[PDB]
Amino acid sequence: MSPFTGSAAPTPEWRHLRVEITDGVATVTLARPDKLNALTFEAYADLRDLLAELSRRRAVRALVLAGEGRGFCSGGDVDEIIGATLSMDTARLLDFNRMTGQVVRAVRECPFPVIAALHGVAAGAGAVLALAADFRVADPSTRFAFLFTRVGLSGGDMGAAYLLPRVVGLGHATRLLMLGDTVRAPEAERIGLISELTEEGRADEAARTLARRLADGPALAHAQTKALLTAELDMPLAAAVELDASTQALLMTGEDYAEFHAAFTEKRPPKWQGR
Amino acid sequence: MSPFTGSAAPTPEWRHLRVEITDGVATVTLARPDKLNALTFEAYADLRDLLAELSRRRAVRALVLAGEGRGFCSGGDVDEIIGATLSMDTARLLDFNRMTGQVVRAVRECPFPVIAALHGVAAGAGAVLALAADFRVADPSTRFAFLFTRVGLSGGDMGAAYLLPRVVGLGHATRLLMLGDTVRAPEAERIGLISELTEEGRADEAARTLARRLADGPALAHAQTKALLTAELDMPLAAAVELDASTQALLMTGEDYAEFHAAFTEKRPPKWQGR
Amino acid sequence: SPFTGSAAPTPEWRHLRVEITDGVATVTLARPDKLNALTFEAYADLRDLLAELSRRRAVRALVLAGEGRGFCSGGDVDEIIGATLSMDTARLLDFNRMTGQVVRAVRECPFPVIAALHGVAAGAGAVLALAADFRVADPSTRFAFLFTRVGLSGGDMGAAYLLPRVVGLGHATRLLMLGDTVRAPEAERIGLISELTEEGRADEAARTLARRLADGPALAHAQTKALLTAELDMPLAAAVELDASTQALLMTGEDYAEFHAAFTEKRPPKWQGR
Ligand SMILES: [Zn+2]
Ligand SMILES: [Zn+2]
């Protein structure tokens, strides 16, 4: 845990999503299965604020993002978001779109791996949240749809036009984002959108197993792996090797690197501490 | 379209390529099936000048790039291009190579989607033109050859070294550009070069159908999807979400977004206007 | 290239095997018994050799190979890891800078680099292969980016920059974070393999590819690599400027002119690399 806290206290209760933490693994289950977990303004606000809170306290070592019911997440609620935005002032339109983009950025920047447990529909914001995760663990019913243009918006929504070509290549990104057609599991797997394909109904269990695998590993090493992937997407080669050099040298002063060698020489399992 | 015209008038007749516009869709057909549609200096000049004139008046909602005869385009005419360049002065050599790269840039930047209808060979410049398009609609005879090195020039010609790795990955791009070997339809599909694979002989019809599909949709949403994809290839994550935020907020003030919600509430199809 | 000064070429390379024939350099990693595990001195030789070969433009292609049961298992657990555990801050930084500089030097060589893969390619072995322009691999090839297995991050010596640009961010995150083995079929599917050979034929296929490249127009090949590498880090408008200058320049070269001469008279072009 991080000692760098001040006047601000942790939120006692998260009302717009379900948050459970066990042994360093957070599980965030989207609310509203009867609506395919369609997101509201308040759910975005809780995503933003929860991630900021977990990040500043270095609270967990892995996070699973899940949805109950018939699918993962259908995106923003058509009445509670879209209908409401039709009567918002200019500043509040900008604030809403900035908030969703900073949710995706917060997923990309939080000091622990994020795993999306996917099944049925992941559409609109649901598909971008999945895309921002470090891992997508998906069952065969999983259907992505980047369908912003179908509501008259651009496919550059909350980072999708930045992330998608970096995951699947520019030719596939353009097709997916401009036409908004459904991408079923086999195509998704072929083009690079799936980290682990599971058996039908097993996505949540496999996501939990992957989370625990990561949480059992060297946390600082994992978190810095994510940090360097993310930063170096936006850096030139010469700068990337400077960040690598600094980071690897720092980690070589850590307990975990020393423990690897001690365990290796003593022919036993390493016991990681994440420092 | 766009009222922002001044003293400059539209070109009445395009002489070095065939241009046809029907109901917001431009079809540009390369001339010279006899010569495998090899590109002349004037053909490049007409591409440059037509895209500029289509762009500055937002004239169309989609553009198909096509080639008659046995194949899409064999590249630069060997007698008419290479032979001529061998007696050019230093400023003209630079002018020529600037113009070709400009053409590719203009394809990436024009405010409407561009579709390449591919069959037979797309080689050299013809391969790069196809690569720059937003969609590549290809029948099974389609071949790509990025074969600049075969003529003693570098494979990073007119933007190929920039675009190809962002479409197929750095490993594949290196191999394609350094060796210049033919890529046939199955490999092209595998590595991400093909947007839609058609039956033999159906590429032009399928491209037309796709263009009409795009032209029937919300044109401003499509255009911004392309602009954001293009710009965000060259931006960091934090900047990308600021561009997404301004753009989406802007589109939420548009008629097409409002019409999506109106259509939804009356359970009817949206009638898009592109504003 | 004639641009040499007080500094003389290194007479003998003790920490790897270096053989040059008709413009092709073959670099064979030492220590086949230890799966060619790297020492500090092996890294130093890679750095210093690549710098010599580059400043002289001595070679038109370079093959990176390893003998024994596998390509390269990475840094030596005793001679590197063991040693690093008692190093001071400055030397820890120095070491990790050196490894990244070797990878950068591979990306910046003015000739193509080809990795001849088979068996295990792990840790630095995986990243060295990743940095090569071509990966020529037989079906036994197994990649493992296993830095996190030793408590270090997957952003070792450029891996976090290179891998997503080769296989996509989703695959790169998986590979670098879990460090699981990637066998040949998967490697092929995700874009890590340039040419898949039959068992035991990687070194031969690599030799053949190197010669194919050394037989071609060398300036065109080198600039192809230079532009690919630079343009990964440049925006589109700047990339077409670099292409413009470069193509204009190569159009003043002998090879381009030779091509028109040749292709005209239906005789094969005879390249000169200028
Ligand atoms: Zn990519
Ligand atoms: Zn980039």
Q: DSSP letters along A223-242, please?
A: HHHHHHHHHHTTS-HHHHHH
Intervals of CATH 3.90.226.10 along chain C: 1-215
For residues C121 and C36, give the distance between their C-alpha atoms in angstroms, rounded to a whole number. Answer: 10
For residues B215 and A117, give the distance between their C-alpha atoms in angstroms, rounded to a whole number. Answer: 36
Contacts of A71 by beta carbon, 8 Å cutoff, 6+ apart = A36, A37, A119, A120, A121, A122, A143
Cβ contact, residue pair B225, A178, below 8 Å: yes
- Token pair 């600037």 is at which residue? B98
Q: Which long-range contacts (CB under 8 A, 24 or more apart) does C178-181 make?
A: C178/A213, C178/A214, C178/C148, C179/C144, C179/C145, C179/C146, C179/C147, C179/C148, C179/C149, C179/C154, C180/C144, C181/C142, C181/C143, C181/C144
Residue A180 contacts residue A145 (beta carbons within 8 Å) = yes
Intervals of CATH 1.10.12.10 along chain C: 216-274
User: Which of helix, strand or coil describes residue A152?
Assistant: coil
Six-digit token string for A156: 């550059």
Q: Please tell me the distance between residue B165's alpha carbon and the centre of ligand 2 in angstroms.
A: 10
Residue A162 contacts residue B237 (beta carbons within 8 Å) = yes
Optimal mutation site among A244, A257, A260, interface C, most CBs of chain C within 10 A: A244
Q: What's the burial of B266, exposed, middle or buried (CB within 10 Å: 0-12/13-18/19+)?
A: exposed
Residue B143 contacts residue B120 (beta carbons within 8 Å) = yes
For residues C23 and C61, give the distance between their C-alpha atoms in angstroms, rounded to a whole number. Answer: 7
- Say which DSSP state C34 is in: G
> Which amino acid, C170?
G
Hey, which CATH number is domain C216-274, 2.40.37.10, 3.30.70.2190, 3.20.20.70, 1.10.12.10?
1.10.12.10
Give chain A's length.
275
| Strand partners for B42 | none
Residue B270 contacts residue A82 (beta carbons within 8 Å) = no
Chain C residue nearest residue B83, CA to CA:
C260
According to DSSP, the β-strands at C182-183 and C142-144 are antiparallel
Q: Which long-range contacts (CB under 8 A, 24 or more apart) does C211-215 make?
A: C211/C24, C211/C61, C212/B179, C213/B178, C213/C60, C213/C61, C213/C111, C213/C112, C213/C114, C214/C22, C214/C23, C214/C24, C214/C60, C214/C61, C215/C271
Q: What is the dihedral of CA A256, A257, A260, A266, to 10 degrees?
A: -100
Chain C residue nearest residue A134, CA to CA:
C173
For residues B66 and B6, give the distance between their C-alpha atoms in angstroms, rounded to a whole number. Answer: 31
Q: Please tell me the distance between residue A251's alpha carbon and the centre of ligand 1 in angstroms.
A: 28
**Backbone torsions φ then ψ of A135, nearest 5 degrees:** -130, 140
CA end-to-end span of chain A, whole Å?
11
For residues B47 and B102, give the distance between their C-alpha atoms in angstroms, rounded to a whole number. Answer: 10
For residues B75 and B67, give the distance between their C-alpha atoms in angstroms, rounded to a whole number. Answer: 12
Q: How far is C140 from chain B (nearest CA, A)?
A: 20
Intervals of CATH 3.90.226.10 along chain B: 2-216
Residue C130 contacts residue C159 (beta carbons within 8 Å) = yes
Cβ contact, residue pair C232, B149, below 8 Å: no
Residue B167 contacts residue C239 (beta carbons within 8 Å) = no
Among residues C13, A151, C243, the alpha carbon closest in space to that of B225 is found at A151
Intervals of CATH 1.10.12.10 along chain A: 217-275
Residues 136-175 of C with CB under 8 A from B: 162, 165-168
| Strand partners for C132 | none
Among residues B244, B226, B224, B248, the alpha carbon closest in space to that of B236 is found at B244
| Strand partners for B184 | B143
**How many other C-beta atoms are found inside a 10 Å radius of the C-beta of residue B116?**
28
User: The dihedral of CA C150, C151, C156, C161: what is its sign?
Assistant: positive
User: Which of helix, strand or coil describes residue C235?
Assistant: coil
Q: What is the dihedral of CA B31, B35, B36, B41, to 10 degrees?
A: -60
Smallest Cβ distance to C153: which of A241, A251, A272? A251
Optimal mutation site among C106, C130, C192, C243, interface B, most CBs of chain B within 10 A: C243
**Chain A hits for B271, Cβ within 8 Å:** none
Among residues A7, A2, A70, the alpha carbon closest in space to that of A36 is found at A70
For A114, the enclosing helix (H) or strand (E) is strand A114-118
Six-digit token string for B231: 């710009």
Smallest Cβ distance to B171: which of C192, C219, C256? C192
Q: Please tell me the distance between residue A240's alpha carbon and the centre of ligand 2 in angstroms.
A: 12
User: Which of helix, strand or coil describes residue A34?
Assistant: helix
Cβ contact, residue pair B179, C242, below 8 Å: no
Residue B31 contacts residue B43 (beta carbons within 8 Å) = yes
Residues 83-122 of B with CB under 8 A from A: 113
**Backbone torsions φ then ψ of A105, nearest 5 degrees:** -60, -40
Optimal mutation site among B128, B172, B220, B252, interface A, most CBs of chain A within 10 A: B252
> Which amino acid, B114?
V
Cβ contact, residue pair A94, B166, below 8 Å: no
According to DSSP, the β-strands at B18-22 and B25-30 are antiparallel
- Token pair 């630069």 is at which residue? B76
Six-digit token string for A40: 């509201």
For C77, the enclosing helix (H) or strand (E) is none
- Token pair 């022919």 is at which residue? A267
For residues B25 and B21, give the distance between their C-alpha atoms in angstroms, rounded to a whole number. Answer: 6
Give the burial string for A152-182 (b: 16+ CB within 10 Å, else e): bbbbbbbbbbbbbbbbbbbbbbbbbbbbbee
| Strand partners for B30 | B67
Compute the count of residue pairs across chains A and C with CB atoms less than 8 Å apart.
161
Give me the half-sphere count of Cα atoms (radius 13 Å) on the Cβ side of residue C191. Answer: 34
B127 touches chain A (CB under 8 A): no
The topology under which CATH files domain B217-275 is Lyase 2-enoyl-coa Hydratase; Chain  A, domain 2 (1.10.12)
Q: Please tell me the distance between residue A163's alpha carbon and the centre of ligand 1 in angstroms.
A: 10
Hey, which CATH number is domain C1-215, 3.30.750.200, 3.90.226.10, 3.10.270.10, 3.40.50.2300?
3.90.226.10
Cβ contact, residue pair C228, B161, below 8 Å: yes
**Backbone torsions φ then ψ of C65, nearest 5 degrees:** -135, 165
Q: Sheet holding A143-145: strands in order across?
A: A121-123, A143-145, A183-184
C73 touches chain A (CB under 8 A): no
**In Å, how far from its chain's centre is CA A238?**
28
Give me the half-sphere count of Cα atoms (radius 13 Å) on the Cβ side of residue B201. Answer: 0
Residue B162 contacts residue C244 (beta carbons within 8 Å) = no
Distances B31 to B15, B251, C1 between C-alpha atoms, Å:
9, 39, 45
For residues C240 and A265, give the distance between their C-alpha atoms in angstroms, rounded to a whole number. Answer: 54
Among residues A201, A188, A207, the alpha carbon closest in space to that of A144 is found at A188
- Token pair 């930047």 is at which residue? B109
For residues B156 and B144, give the distance between their C-alpha atoms in angstroms, rounded to a whole number. Answer: 15
Six-digit token string for A140: 């065969």
Contacts of B275 by beta carbon, 8 Å cutoff, 6+ apart = B220, B254, B255, B256
Q: Please tell me the distance between residue B233's alpha carbon and the centre of ligand 2 in angstroms.
A: 6
| Strand partners for A197 | A138
Cβ contact, residue pair A152, B229, below 8 Å: no
B178 touches chain C (CB under 8 A): yes
CATH 3.90.226.10 holds for B2-216: yes
Q: How far is A271 from chain B (nearest CA, A)?
A: 35
Give chain B's length.
275
Contacts of A29 by beta carbon, 8 Å cutoff, 6+ apart = A17, A18, A20, A66, A67, A68
- Say which DSSP state C23 is in: T
CA end-to-end span of chain C, whole Å?
11
For residues C36 and C13, give the distance between their C-alpha atoms in angstroms, rounded to a whole number. Answer: 16
Give me the half-sphere count of Cα atoms (radius 13 Å) on the Cβ side of residue A175. Answer: 22
Smallest Cβ distance to A152: which of B228, B241, B257? B257
Residue C31 contacts residue C37 (beta carbons within 8 Å) = yes
> Which bin fits C134, alpha (ψ -120 to 50), beta or left (φ > 0)?
beta
